[PDB]
Scaffold this active site. Structure first.
Site, short mmCIF file in Angstrom:
data_model
loop_
_atom_site.label_atom_id
_atom_site.label_comp_id
_atom_site.label_asym_id
_atom_site.label_seq_id
_atom_site.Cartn_x
_atom_site.Cartn_y
_atom_site.Cartn_z
CG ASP A 268 49.11 -6.55 -18.89
OD1 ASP A 268 48.67 -7.66 -19.25
OD2 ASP A 268 48.56 -5.86 -18.02
CD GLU B 99 54.14 10.82 -30.92
OE1 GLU B 99 54.41 9.69 -31.36
OE2 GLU B 99 53.09 11.07 -30.29
#
Ligand SMILES: Cc1cc2nc3c(=O)[nH]c(=O)nc-3n(C[C@H](O)[C@H](O)[C@H](O)COP(=O)(O)OP(=O)(O)OC[C@H]3O[C@@H](n4cnc5c(N)ncnc54)[C@H](O)[C@@H]3O)c2cc1C
Ligand SMILES: Cc1cc2nc3c(=O)[nH]c(=O)nc-3n(C[C@H](O)[C@H](O)[C@H](O)COP(=O)(O)OP(=O)(O)OC[C@H]3O[C@@H](n4cnc5c(N)ncnc54)[C@H](O)[C@@H]3O)c2cc1C
Ligand SMILES: Cc1cc2nc3c(=O)[nH]c(=O)nc-3n(C[C@H](O)[C@H](O)[C@H](O)COP(=O)(O)OP(=O)(O)OC[C@H]3O[C@@H](n4cnc5c(N)ncnc54)[C@H](O)[C@@H]3O)c2cc1C
Ligand SMILES: Cc1cc2nc3c(=O)[nH]c(=O)nc-3n(C[C@H](O)[C@H](O)[C@H](O)COP(=O)(O)OP(=O)(O)OC[C@H]3O[C@@H](n4cnc5c(N)ncnc54)[C@H](O)[C@@H]3O)c2cc1C
Ligand SMILES: [Cl-]
Ligand SMILES: [Cl-]
Lengths: 383, 383, 383, 383
Positions: D131, D244
Site C-alpha cells: 500500500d 539513484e
C-alpha cells in the site's frame, strides 16, 4: 565540463537583455499593432552591437564567438516583444554582415562592412527563388560573365528586409551545373539600374518584418562587387546558413524563456474549482513539457555554438539545434495558449501573436525536413 | 452497420455545400480582410436553414436530427472560408435556438422562436464569467427572486454575438449553492434597462466573429422570461453544450476536409529536387496523418450524433468527438503550413488564418481537459 | 448510416467470444508458460469455424463477409489470452485458406480446401525471403518451367506455422522481371523431396506461434499444383494481404478492448494518496487515450470491411486500419503497463507479455511505413 | 561553459567501458538465456569500483563526484548487454552504499561499509510496500521503540537483490504520522530471527535481476543498527533516490548509445528497393529522433550531476533527467525494433529484450508521473 557562463558572457547577456527591455520593448505594442518596422530604432540596436557578431574591431565589431553571439540574441528574444524587428536585425547580421566579413575582399569590406556593422546601411540576403527553396542549387538566376563583370537576370522571393535594404547580397549561377561550384555571390546597391525591388508583401507571422520579391533585369555587376571567388557562393551560402541557423535561432529560445515565465505566473494566479489551475495535472503536465523543451534545446544550442568556437565540426549539432528549437517553440506556443483558455484571445497579451511569430522558425534557413536530411547525411544515411 | 448517408442526408449535405460555396464564400476574402460580419448575409444563411436544426415546422424549422444537423454544418465548414460567420451562425443555433425550443414555455416560443429560426433576431448565449469558465457552476451573477420576477446583477465575458444580438439567453444563480439546481436561464432583450453590452473586443482567431462582455446592473427580469423551470439552467446549459459540442464541431471537420484537398493538390504540383514534394516521405507522412485524422474524427462525430438520434446516452461520445476534432484540426493546420513552406505565408491562400480559426476549437464549449474530465467521469474514474 | 451490428453479427461475435473464453482461454497460462502451440486445440478452433471465413458451404465454410469475419476474430482477440495460437489460426485462414478458395482450380480445391477449412490440414504462407521483405517483388526463389511443371529453388524466412504445416502456399518467380506478372503461387505438401523445413526459431513476441525458414532444393512442382494462372502470384499475394491486413488485425482490436477493461478495473481499485489512482489526471489522461484509440480504430476497421463487402475499393481503408490498429495496440500496451507501475511486472497478469505480442502487429503483412506508401499511392502522391 | 570531459573523466569512462566489454559482456548471452545473476561476477565488478561512488578512501572508495559516477555507469550501460546485473550492482551502490556512507554512525560504517564497497557483502534497499509505492510515506511497516532498540513488523515488496542480499537497508515508521519525520532507516542482517525473505519472483523485464518480497515478523532491531537519527528515514530515503535517479539512470543513456550505433549500422547495410533502408525518410526520421533524444538527455543528465557536484540545488534537474532518459529509452527501443522489421525478432541480437529492460526505467525510484509532481512542486505549482 562546466555549465556556467563566463563573467564576460553573463555581462554580454545582461547588457543585451537590458537594452531589449529598456529600449526595444518600449512602445513595442504600438509598433506591433501598426505593423511598423522602425528603421531608426533598428539602427540604434545595430549600433548598440546586435549587428557586430564576430566582426573584428577594425570594422567596428566586437570579435564575439558563436556562443557569445547566441547569448546576446537569446537576451534580445527574451527582452523584446518586437520579434519581427529582432528577426530583421539578426538576419542582417547572420546572413549579410558575417558572409561579407568572412569572404569579401579588402576592397569590399573597406567600402561597406563598417557601415553594415554600425547601423548605417541595411542589407538583405537574396538566394531563394520560385523554383529553388529547399533545392537551393536549382536557382535559375544567372550572372553571365562578360567584359568587366557579369550580366545578372532572375527573380528572388521571400527576401527579408528587401523593402528597407540599401544593399543586397545576391546568389546567382555563374556556371550551368547544380554543383557545389556553380553559384557565386555579389553585393549590389539599391538603385542599380535593372534592380526592381517589389513592394512589401504582408504576412500574419512576423508581420512587421518586411519582405518582398526582387527582380533583376539585365543588371551589370562590376567584377569588384563579387563576394569571394567565382563559384564560392554555394559555400558562402552554406556558411551563412550555419551562422543563421545557430545564432539566429537563439531568438526563439529567449522567446520561450519569456513565454514559460508568463505561463507559470498565470497558472499560479488563475483559480478554478477552488485552486490554482496549475494544481491540475493536465495543466502542469503541459507546462512541465515547456520547461523540459526549453532546458534541452538551450543546452543543444550552447553546445553547437561552443563546438564551432572550438573549431570542431558543428554542422549536425547546428541542424539538430535548429530543428529542436523551432519545433519546441511552436508546440510551447500552443501549450501556453491552452493554459490560458479564452484569455489567450487577448491581443495585448499577445499569446496568439507569439505563436504566429514562431511558425516561421521551422521554415527559415532550411525547413526542419531539410535539417533532418542534413543530419541523416552526417550520420552516414545518404551514402 | 452501414457507412452510407441516406439519400435525404446526401441532399441536405449537397444543398448546404452549394449554399456555402455560391452564397457565403463569395466575397469572403473582402469581409475577412476587413473583419466584417455581414448581418444581412448572416440572416440569409439563417433563413436558408442553418438556424433551423431540430426545431419543429410549427416554428419554421426543419425537424432535423443531430446527424442531419451535423452534416449540414460540415458542408458549411467545407464550402465557406468565412468560418467566423459560420461559427457565429452555429452558436446562435446550438446554444440559443435549440435550448429555447427544448425548454421554453409555449408563450416564450410563440413570442421569439420563429424569429430566431428564420433570420429575424440574432441571439447570444451568456454563461461564462471572469471567475467561472471551466468551473461554470461557480458563476456569481445573481437573479434574486422578487415580486413579479427577478433582480439580475453580474458580468458575463467571451460572449459570441453579443455586439450584434437582439436577445440574450442568460444563466444566473437563483440559489446560493453550486449544485445542479442553483442556476436558472432567462431571455432578455437588447435595450432592457440595466443591460450594458460592451463594445466588440478584437481577436486574431475567428477575427470577424464579434464577442464582448455584458454587464447586468439591477435588471428586472419578468417572471415570464425565465426559460424552463427554476433551477433548470444547469441542466439547460448542459444540454445546450451537448448540441454545440457535437453539431457545431462539424464545422472543423468540413474545414479539415477542405484543407486536406488543398494540401494534396499542392503536394502534387510543387516540385523540388526534380519531383513533386509529396514524393518525399517526410512530406507524405504528414499528409497521411491529416487524412487519418479526418477519417477517424468524422466517424466518431457521426456515431455520436447517430447515438443521440437513437435515444442512446451519447455524452461520452460527444466529448470524445469534440476533443478529437479540435486537436486534429489544430495539428492538421500546422501540418498544412509545413507542407507549403514559405508559400504558407500568403494571406490570400489563408493557411495561417485557417490555423488561427482552429485554435479556439479546443476551448469553446469546454476545453479539451474538461472533455477528458467528462470522459473520465463516464468511465467511472471520478467515483 | 447505422452503427449497430445486425442480429446475425451479434450472434457470430458472441458465439466466437464464448468459444474463445470457454475453450481456448482455459489452461492458456500453462501453454503460454511452456511455449506450447497445441495443434489439437488449434484444430478444434479451426473446425468450430475460425478457419471458415468467406469459403462456400460446398467446402465446409460459412460464406462470411469481411465484416463478419473481422467480428469473429475480434471476439477471439478479446476472449483468449493465447494470442499466439489465435495469430497462427488466423494466418492459416487469411493467407492460405482464402487465396486457395479464391484462385485455385476446382481440382486443387476439391483435393485440399475442405481439409484446410475444417481442421484437418494446417497451411503456411511462404513469400518473404532474406532479400525480399518490404520489397516482396525482389524475391529470388525461382519456379523454372519444365516438362510437366516447374523446378523450384530458393529460401523463405519468417514463415508462420511452417514447423507444424502440412501444406505450403509458396510464391516464386516464373519470369525474371520484378513486374506485377513475374510471380506465381503453388501448393506444395510437407515431405515433398527437396522441401527442407527448418526447426522452430524461438522469439519473445507471439512466442508459442511457431515460425521457421524453409529451403527449396530442386523441388519438382507438378503443373496441377499451381494456384491460379501463371504470373497471378503477385496479384494473389496482394489479395491475400488485403484479407490478412483487415480481418487478421481485428485480433489486436479485441485484445485492446480486453486490455482497456483490465486497466480501468485496476485504476478504480488501486489507491494511493487516499484515492483511486484513476482520480489523478496523469493516470486518467492515458486511459482516455486508450479508449479514444480503441473506438477510432474499431470504426475504421469496420468501415474498411464493410466497404469490401459492398464491392467498393477498400485498399487505402484497409491500409489505414492496419496502421492505426497496430500503432494503437503497441502504445496502449505501454500505457497499461505505466498504469500498473511495479505491479505490471507480474508474469501471470501478462501485461508485459501482451505488449510483446502487439509489437509484431506493426510488421506482419507489410510494415506501417509500407502502409503509408500504399496510402500515399492511393492519394496520388506516387505519380 | 565547456562540453568536454576532463582527462580524469575520460579515463574513468574508458576504463569502465573496457571492463564492461572485456569482463561483464563476456558470456553475457548464456547468463541472459539462463536468467543467471552470477554473484561471483557481480563481486568482481563491485571490487573493480562500481560499488565505490563518492565513498571515501577510508572505506575503500574512490571519492567520485556525481558526474564521475554517472560517467562510469554510462560506460557500463554501453559496454555490457547484461543490464540486469548492472542494474543490480548500481542499486546496491546508489540506494544502499551511499546512504550508509552519508548517514550511518562511525560504528555502523566501520562494521559494514568497506565490505559493501568492495564486493564482500550485497545489500538490498527495502522501502516499497503493497500500500505504499508512489505514496511512500503511507508505509505501514512499524519499528516500535522498546528497551534496547525496536520491534519491527511489516512487509516490503519489489525489493531488488533481496534473494541474494546479506544486509537490508529497511525503512519503517517510528511515529504514526505521514510527515517528513515519521520514518527511520535500519540495517538488518540476513538470518536475523523474524526476517523472512521470499523466493525470487520472475519477471520478463531485467529478468536475471532478482527481486522478492520480505516480511518482518517481530524482528528485534538493536538500537545501534539505526541509520542516522530517529525520523531521518524520510530524508535518507529521499537523498538515496536523488543519487539513484541521476547516476543509476546513466545506465540507460549508455544503453541508448549502444542501441543507436547498432541501429545505424543496420540501416546502412540492409537494402530493399535497391538502396540502404536508411535512405527512406520514414526510416531515417526515426533514427534521427533516437539521436536527438540521446544528445538531449545526456546533456540534461550531465548538468544535473554537475549541479550536484557544485553544491547547487539539483532536485528538479535530476527529476527532469530521470523522466527524459526513461521515456527516451523506451521509445528508442521501439524505434530500433521498427528499423529492423522481422529481423528484430531475433533473441540473440536482443532488440526486444533491450526494450523489456528499458520498460522499468519509467517506474523505479518513482514513476515519471511522480517526477512531474516533483518538478511541478519545484516550479511553484503545488503551493
Ligand atoms: C520568415 C522567413 C524569412 C525568410 N528570409 C529569406 C531571406 O531573407 N532570403 C532568402 O533567400 N530566403 C528567405 N526565406 C526563404 C526560405 O529560405 C525558404 O522558405 C526555405 O528555403 C524553404 O523553401 P520553400 O519555402 O520554397 O519550401 P519548399 O522547398 O517548397 O518545401 C515545401 C515542403 O516540401 C518539403 N521538402 C522539400 N524538399 C524536401 C526534401 N528533399 N525532403 C523532404 N522534404 C522536402 C519541405 O520540407 C516543405 O515541407 C525566408 C523564409 C521565411 C519563412
Ligand atoms: C471562440 C470562443 C467562443 C466562446 N463563446 C462563448 C459564448 O458565446 N458564451 C459563453 O458563456 N462562453 C463562451 N466562451 C467561453 C468558454 O466557455 C470558456 O472559454 C471555456 O468555458 C473555458 O473557460 P476559461 O476560458 O475561463 O478557461 P479556464 O477555465 O480558466 O481554463 C484555463 C486552463 O485551466 C484548465 N483547467 C481548468 N479547470 C481544470 C480542471 N478541473 N482540470 C484540468 N484542467 C483544468 C483548462 O483546461 C485550461 O487549460 C467562448 C470561448 C471561445 C474560445
Ligand atoms: C509475426 C510475423 C509473422 C510473419 N509471418 C509471415 C509468413 O507467414 N509468411 C511470409 O512470407 N512472411 C511473414 N512475415 C514477414 C513479413 O512479411 C516481413 O517481416 C515484412 O514484409 C517486412 O519485411 P522485413 O522484415 O524484411 O523488413 P524490411 O523490409 O527489411 O524493413 C526494415 C525497415 O525498413 C523500412 N522500409 C523498407 N522499405 C521501405 C520503404 N520503401 N519506404 C519506407 N520504409 C521502408 C521498413 O518499414 C522497416 O522499418 C512475418 C513477420 C512477422 C513480424
Ligand atoms: C525494476 C524495479 C526495481 C525496483 N527496486 C525497488 C527496491 O529495490 N526497493 C524498494 O523499496 N522499491 C523498489 N521498486 C518499487 C518502486 O519504488 C515502485 O514500483 C514505485 O515507487 C512505484 O510504486 P508502485 O509500483 O506501487 O506504483 P503505484 O504507486 O501504484 O502507481 C500506479 C500508477 O499510478 C500513478 N500515480 C500514483 N500516484 C500518483 C499521483 N500522485 N499523481 C499522478 N499519478 C500517480 C503512478 O504514476 C502509476 O502510473 C522497484 C520497482 C521496479 C520497477
Ligand atoms: Cl490531477
Ligand atoms: Cl523518402
Amino acid at each position: 565540463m562546466d555549465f556556467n557562463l563566463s563573467n564576460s558572457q553573463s555581462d554580454i547577456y545582461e547588457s543585451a537583455y537590458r537594452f531589449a527591455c529598456d529600449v526595444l520593448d518600449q512602445d513595442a505594442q504600438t509598433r506591433i499593432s501598426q505593423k511598423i518596422l522602425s528603421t531608426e530604432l533598428w539602427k540604434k540596436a545595430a549600433a548598440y552591437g546586435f549587428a557586430h557578431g564576430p566582426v573584428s574591431h577594425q570594422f567596428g565589431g566586437s570579435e564575439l564567438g558563436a556562443l557569445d553571439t547566441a547569448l546576446m540574441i537569446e537576451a534580445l528574444g527574451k527582452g523584446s516583444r518586437d520579434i519581427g524587428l529582432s528577426f530583421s536585425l539578426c538576419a542582417h547580421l547572420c546572413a549579410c554582415v558575417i558572409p561579407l566579413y568572412r569572404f569579401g575582399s579588402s576592397e569590399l569590406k573597406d567600402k561597406y562592412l563598417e557601415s553594415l556593422v554600425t547601423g548605417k546601411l541595411i542589407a538583405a540576403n537574396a538566394a531563394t527563388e520560385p523554383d529553388a527553396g529547399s533545392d537551393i542549387y536549382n536557382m535559375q538566376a544567372t550572372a553571365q560573365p562578360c567584359e568587366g563583370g557579369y550580366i545578372l537576370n532572375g527573380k528572388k522571393i521571400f527576401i527579408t528586409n528587401a523593402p528597407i535594404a540599401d544593399v543586397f547580397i545576391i546568389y546567382a549561377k555563374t556556371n550551368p551545373d547544380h554543383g557545389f561550384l556553380g553559384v557565386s555571390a555579389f553585393l549590389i546597391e539599391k538603385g542599380t539600374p535593372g534592380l526592381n525591388v517589389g513592394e512589401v508583401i504582408p504576412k500574419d507571422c512576423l508581420s512587421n518584418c518586411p519582405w518582398s520579391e526582387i527582380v533583376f533585369n539585365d543588371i551589370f555587376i562590376p567584377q569588384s562587387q563579387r563576394i569571394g571567388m567565382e563559384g564560392a557562393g554555394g559555400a558562402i551560402f552554406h556558411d551563412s546558413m550555419i551562422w543563421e541557423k545557430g545564432c539566429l535561432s537563439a531568438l526563439f529560445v529567449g522567446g520561450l524563456a519569456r513565454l514559460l515565465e508568463t505561463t507559470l505566473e498565470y497558472a499560479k494566479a488563475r483559480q478554478q474549482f477552488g485552486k490554482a489551475i496549475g494544481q491540475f495535472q493536465s495543466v502542469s503536465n503541459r507546462i512541465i513539457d515547456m520547461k523540459l523543451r526549453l532546458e534541452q534545446c538551450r543546452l543543444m544550442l550552447y553546445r553547437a555554438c561552443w563546438k564551432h568556437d572550438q573549431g570542431q565540426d558543428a554542422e549536425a549539432d547546428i541542424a539538430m539545434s535548429k530543428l529542436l528549437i523551432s519545433e519546441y517553440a511552436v508546440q510551447s506556443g500552443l501549450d501556453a495558449i491552452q493554459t490560458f483558455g479564452g484569455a489567450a484571445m487577448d491581443q495585448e497579451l499577445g499569446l496568439v501573436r507569439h505563436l504566429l511569430n514562431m511558425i516561421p522558425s521551422r521554415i527559415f534557413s532550411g525547413t526542419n525536413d531539410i535539417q533532418k536530411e542534413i543530419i541523416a547525411r552526417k550520420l552516414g544515411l545518404r551514402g
